[PDB]
Design a protein around this motif. Sequence first.
Motif, mmCIF file in Angstrom:
data_model
loop_
_atom_site.group_PDB
_atom_site.id
_atom_site.type_symbol
_atom_site.label_atom_id
_atom_site.label_comp_id
_atom_site.label_asym_id
_atom_site.label_seq_id
_atom_site.Cartn_x
_atom_site.Cartn_y
_atom_site.Cartn_z
ATOM 1 N N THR A 30 0.816 -1.206 0.000
ATOM 2 C CA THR A 30 0.000 0.000 0.000
ATOM 3 C C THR A 30 0.843 1.245 0.000
ATOM 4 O O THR A 30 2.065 1.188 -0.115
ATOM 5 C CB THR A 30 -0.847 0.109 1.254
ATOM 6 O OG1 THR A 30 0.021 0.189 2.400
ATOM 7 C CG2 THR A 30 -1.784 -1.070 1.367
ATOM 8 N N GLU A 31 0.166 2.373 0.152
ATOM 9 C CA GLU A 31 0.842 3.635 0.337
ATOM 10 C C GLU A 31 1.905 3.475 1.405
ATOM 11 O O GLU A 31 3.079 3.790 1.187
ATOM 12 C CB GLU A 31 -0.155 4.695 0.791
ATOM 13 C CG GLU A 31 0.468 6.042 1.069
ATOM 14 C CD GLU A 31 0.861 6.757 -0.206
ATOM 15 O OE1 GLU A 31 1.044 6.074 -1.243
ATOM 16 O OE2 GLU A 31 0.968 8.010 -0.183
ATOM 17 N N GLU A 32 1.482 2.955 2.552
ATOM 18 C CA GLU A 32 2.296 2.980 3.764
ATOM 19 C C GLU A 32 3.413 1.949 3.765
ATOM 20 O O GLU A 32 4.431 2.144 4.418
ATOM 21 C CB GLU A 32 1.411 2.781 5.000
ATOM 22 C CG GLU A 32 0.268 3.765 5.100
ATOM 23 C CD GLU A 32 -0.771 3.557 4.014
ATOM 24 O OE1 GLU A 32 -1.145 2.388 3.760
ATOM 25 O OE2 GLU A 32 -1.214 4.556 3.402
ATOM 26 N N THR A 33 3.220 0.847 3.054
ATOM 27 C CA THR A 33 4.232 -0.197 3.025
ATOM 28 C C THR A 33 5.613 0.425 2.862
ATOM 29 O O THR A 33 5.846 1.148 1.903
ATOM 30 C CB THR A 33 4.017 -1.143 1.849
ATOM 31 O OG1 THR A 33 2.753 -1.809 1.981
ATOM 32 C CG2 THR A 33 5.150 -2.164 1.784
ATOM 33 N N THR A 34 6.532 0.151 3.783
ATOM 34 C CA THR A 34 7.867 0.755 3.720
ATOM 35 C C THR A 34 8.923 -0.186 3.131
ATOM 36 O O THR A 34 9.917 0.270 2.541
ATOM 37 C CB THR A 34 8.332 1.252 5.110
ATOM 38 O OG1 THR A 34 8.601 0.133 5.970
ATOM 39 C CG2 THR A 34 7.260 2.130 5.742
ATOM 40 N N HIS A 35 8.708 -1.493 3.302
ATOM 41 C CA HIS A 35 9.654 -2.514 2.837
ATOM 42 C C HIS A 35 8.996 -3.631 2.025
ATOM 43 O O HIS A 35 7.867 -4.020 2.301
ATOM 44 C CB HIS A 35 10.380 -3.148 4.025
ATOM 45 C CG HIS A 35 11.286 -2.213 4.761
ATOM 46 N ND1 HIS A 35 10.815 -1.135 5.482
ATOM 47 C CD2 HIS A 35 12.635 -2.200 4.900
ATOM 48 C CE1 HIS A 35 11.836 -0.496 6.026
ATOM 49 N NE2 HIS A 35 12.952 -1.122 5.690
ATOM 50 N N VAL A 36 9.731 -4.146 1.045
ATOM 51 C CA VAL A 36 9.336 -5.302 0.255
ATOM 52 C C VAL A 36 10.460 -6.341 0.262
ATOM 53 O O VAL A 36 11.481 -6.172 -0.412
ATOM 54 C CB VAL A 36 9.090 -4.928 -1.223
ATOM 55 C CG1 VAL A 36 8.905 -6.183 -2.061
ATOM 56 C CG2 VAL A 36 7.918 -3.977 -1.351
ATOM 57 N N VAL A 37 10.263 -7.422 1.009
ATOM 58 C CA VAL A 37 11.281 -8.442 1.151
ATOM 59 C C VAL A 37 11.209 -9.493 0.038
ATOM 60 O O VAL A 37 10.261 -10.279 -0.039
ATOM 61 C CB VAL A 37 11.137 -9.110 2.506
ATOM 62 C CG1 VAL A 37 12.277 -10.086 2.740
ATOM 63 C CG2 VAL A 37 11.075 -8.033 3.602
ATOM 64 N N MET A 38 12.219 -9.505 -0.826
ATOM 65 C CA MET A 38 12.250 -10.414 -1.972
ATOM 66 C C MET A 38 13.172 -11.618 -1.760
ATOM 67 O O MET A 38 14.259 -11.506 -1.189
ATOM 68 C CB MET A 38 12.712 -9.673 -3.246
ATOM 69 C CG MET A 38 11.912 -8.440 -3.609
ATOM 70 S SD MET A 38 10.338 -8.847 -4.381
ATOM 71 C CE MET A 38 10.833 -10.011 -5.638
#
Length: 207
Positions: A33-41
């Motif tokens: 979302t807007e707020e999501t700060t991190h995306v762990v791949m």
Amino acid sequence: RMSMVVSDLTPEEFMLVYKFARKHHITLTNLITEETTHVVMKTDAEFVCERTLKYFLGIAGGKWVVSYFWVTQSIKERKMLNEHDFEVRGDVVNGRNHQGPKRARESQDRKIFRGLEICCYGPFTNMPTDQLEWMVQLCGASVVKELSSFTLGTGVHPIVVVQPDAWTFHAIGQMCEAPVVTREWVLDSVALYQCQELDTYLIPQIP
Ligand code: NI
């Protein structure tokens, strides 16, 4: 403050990220979302990942797009390590060393689709049209829903995007005065946080 989603993980792997989140008090959600700060791949040893939708939307919104090794190493060391030290460097598709997440991460002013009007036109597979729309909009484009709704004049630049592959479309030019390109233009562009020349992706149009 801090909020994460994961991509391309196994439940085991996801377990580890949860354990990690619990320890350090990080927010953990299913959707980006807007707020999501991190995306762990999930990456390979040299931080190369599959390009997922979350991968794309992470770059688009200048997020922290970090290897799963950030998690496992941080647990191994009972301390949260440098997000800096684990970034994804590429993906299968766009090569193992392009460094777009970081590009995007800083370039939040010089946004690759600054000054664009984009119409995601027709039908798309493997990706919701509205997510593609969100994506380009995150990159500083204006979305348009109808070929006939492009803003006429100049100094502005309309663009029609299509997925010819999922095309059951060389006649769009007959209905407007904009370049027609593939979705790949957008996706490669976003993955590199670099606006690509249309040359490669242009779809030829019938008079
Ligand atoms: Ni121009």
